[PDB]
Design an enzyme around this catalytic site. Sequence first.
Site, PDB file in Angstrom:
ATOM      1  N   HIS A  40      -1.556   5.575  16.062  1.00  0.00           N
ATOM      2  CA  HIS A  40      -0.509   4.655  15.627  1.00  0.00           C
ATOM      3  C   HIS A  40       0.729   4.837  16.489  1.00  0.00           C
ATOM      4  O   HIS A  40       1.141   5.964  16.803  1.00  0.00           O
ATOM      5  CB  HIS A  40      -0.198   4.894  14.144  1.00  0.00           C
ATOM      6  CG  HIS A  40      -1.401   4.612  13.288  1.00  0.00           C
ATOM      7  ND1 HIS A  40      -1.603   3.397  12.682  1.00  0.00           N
ATOM      8  CD2 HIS A  40      -2.473   5.371  12.951  1.00  0.00           C
ATOM      9  CE1 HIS A  40      -2.738   3.429  12.011  1.00  0.00           C
ATOM     10  NE2 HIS A  40      -3.283   4.614  12.162  1.00  0.00           N
ATOM     11  N   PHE A  50       4.408   1.483   8.607  1.00  0.00           N
ATOM     12  CA  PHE A  50       4.537   2.440   7.494  1.00  0.00           C
ATOM     13  C   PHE A  50       5.682   3.399   7.761  1.00  0.00           C
ATOM     14  O   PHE A  50       6.057   3.685   8.894  1.00  0.00           O
ATOM     15  CB  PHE A  50       3.218   3.157   7.245  1.00  0.00           C
ATOM     16  CG  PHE A  50       2.634   3.969   8.383  1.00  0.00           C
ATOM     17  CD1 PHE A  50       1.912   3.313   9.383  1.00  0.00           C
ATOM     18  CD2 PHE A  50       2.800   5.341   8.459  1.00  0.00           C
ATOM     19  CE1 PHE A  50       1.385   4.068  10.405  1.00  0.00           C
ATOM     20  CE2 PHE A  50       2.254   6.107   9.483  1.00  0.00           C
ATOM     21  CZ  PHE A  50       1.532   5.449  10.468  1.00  0.00           C
ATOM     22  N   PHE A  65       2.117  10.824   1.362  1.00  0.00           N
ATOM     23  CA  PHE A  65       1.594  10.312   2.638  1.00  0.00           C
ATOM     24  C   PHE A  65       2.555   9.282   3.239  1.00  0.00           C
ATOM     25  O   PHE A  65       3.285   9.658   4.183  1.00  0.00           O
ATOM     26  CB  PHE A  65       0.210   9.703   2.499  1.00  0.00           C
ATOM     27  CG  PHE A  65      -0.536   9.286   3.765  1.00  0.00           C
ATOM     28  CD1 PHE A  65      -0.143   9.581   5.061  1.00  0.00           C
ATOM     29  CD2 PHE A  65      -1.699   8.556   3.633  1.00  0.00           C
ATOM     30  CE1 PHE A  65      -0.852   9.163   6.157  1.00  0.00           C
ATOM     31  CE2 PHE A  65      -2.437   8.116   4.723  1.00  0.00           C
ATOM     32  CZ  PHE A  65      -2.004   8.423   5.994  1.00  0.00           C
ATOM     33  N   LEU A 124      -2.295  11.176  12.759  1.00  0.00           N
ATOM     34  CA  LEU A 124      -2.182   9.799  13.231  1.00  0.00           C
ATOM     35  C   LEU A 124      -1.643   9.734  14.658  1.00  0.00           C
ATOM     36  O   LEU A 124      -1.593   8.644  15.250  1.00  0.00           O
ATOM     37  CB  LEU A 124      -1.237   8.972  12.334  1.00  0.00           C
ATOM     38  CG  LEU A 124      -1.672   8.896  10.865  1.00  0.00           C
ATOM     39  CD1 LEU A 124      -0.624   8.137  10.059  1.00  0.00           C
ATOM     40  CD2 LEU A 124      -3.061   8.277  10.715  1.00  0.00           C
ATOM     41  N   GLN A 168       3.704   1.527   2.935  1.00  0.00           N
ATOM     42  CA  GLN A 168       3.283   0.572   3.976  1.00  0.00           C
ATOM     43  C   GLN A 168       3.554  -0.862   3.587  1.00  0.00           C
ATOM     44  O   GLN A 168       3.305  -1.296   2.469  1.00  0.00           O
ATOM     45  CB  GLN A 168       1.790   0.812   4.238  1.00  0.00           C
ATOM     46  CG  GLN A 168       1.200  -0.077   5.329  1.00  0.00           C
ATOM     47  CD  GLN A 168      -0.260   0.295   5.609  1.00  0.00           C
ATOM     48  OE1 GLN A 168      -1.113  -0.595   5.612  1.00  0.00           O
ATOM     49  NE2 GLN A 168      -0.529   1.574   5.821  1.00  0.00           N
ATOM     50  N   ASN A 192      -2.365  -0.459  11.731  1.00  0.00           N
ATOM     51  CA  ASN A 192      -3.245  -1.277  12.593  1.00  0.00           C
ATOM     52  C   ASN A 192      -4.663  -1.297  12.042  1.00  0.00           C
ATOM     53  O   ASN A 192      -4.937  -0.663  11.027  1.00  0.00           O
ATOM     54  CB  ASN A 192      -3.167  -0.778  14.038  1.00  0.00           C
ATOM     55  CG  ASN A 192      -3.571   0.645  14.332  1.00  0.00           C
ATOM     56  OD1 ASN A 192      -2.890   1.421  15.023  1.00  0.00           O
ATOM     57  ND2 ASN A 192      -4.706   1.082  13.826  1.00  0.00           N
ATOM     58  N   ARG A 209       0.868  -1.171   0.000  1.00  0.00           N
ATOM     59  CA  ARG A 209       0.000   0.000   0.000  1.00  0.00           C
ATOM     60  C   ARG A 209       0.905   1.220   0.000  1.00  0.00           C
ATOM     61  O   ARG A 209       1.682   1.392   0.949  1.00  0.00           O
ATOM     62  CB  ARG A 209      -0.925   0.002   1.201  1.00  0.00           C
ATOM     63  CG  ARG A 209      -1.758   1.251   1.381  1.00  0.00           C
ATOM     64  CD  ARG A 209      -2.845   0.974   2.419  1.00  0.00           C
ATOM     65  NE  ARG A 209      -3.531   2.190   2.817  1.00  0.00           N
ATOM     66  CZ  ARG A 209      -4.540   2.744   2.156  1.00  0.00           C
ATOM     67  NH1 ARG A 209      -5.006   2.196   1.027  1.00  0.00           N
ATOM     68  NH2 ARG A 209      -5.081   3.857   2.634  1.00  0.00           N
TER      69      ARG A 209
END
Length: 172
Positions: free
Chosen positions: A133, A120, A67, A129, A70, A109, A62
């Site tokens: 996270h 990530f 951004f 986040l 991951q 998660n 991903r």
Amino acid sequence: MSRSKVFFDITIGGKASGRIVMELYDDVVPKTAGNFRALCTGENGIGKSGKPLHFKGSKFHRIIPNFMIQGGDFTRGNGTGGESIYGEKFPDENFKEKHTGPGVLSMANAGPNTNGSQFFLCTVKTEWLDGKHVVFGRVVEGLDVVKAVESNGSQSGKPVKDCMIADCGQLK
Ligand code: PRO
């Protein structure tokens, strides 16, 4: 007790793309750092999944431009899988470290206390986040390699080609 150093050697479409070196925050989040460290060395062998507890040969499944990138799903390769050394999931250790910029290393998660092996590497500050996270390390070498991977992501998150952890381990 010193911070751990670990690395990924990355390939993109099969081509050698360089090494990412990461420092882990063993002092702040020992359990979370320890999980990731052991997943880089592969030292706990075969998991409950019947697959190696090892990032070697896994992909960044991903990748979202502007951004993060991951990976860590070495059981299903698609974000549905993964396994921590402790078992399927472990609780959020703490939220002491924040997502302050590019190079932050943090746990992916599925909601509170669902840490497994997915992680990530941020390419931007991702302050939304924070508290959601667990941040457990930072890139210290190879941010350009992170950027190369990032260029193969899409808004959709699907990669345009395979970005693989061709080798990994612990340094020094
Ligand atoms: O995959 C995502 O979009 C969120 C943000 C980073 C980790 N989980």
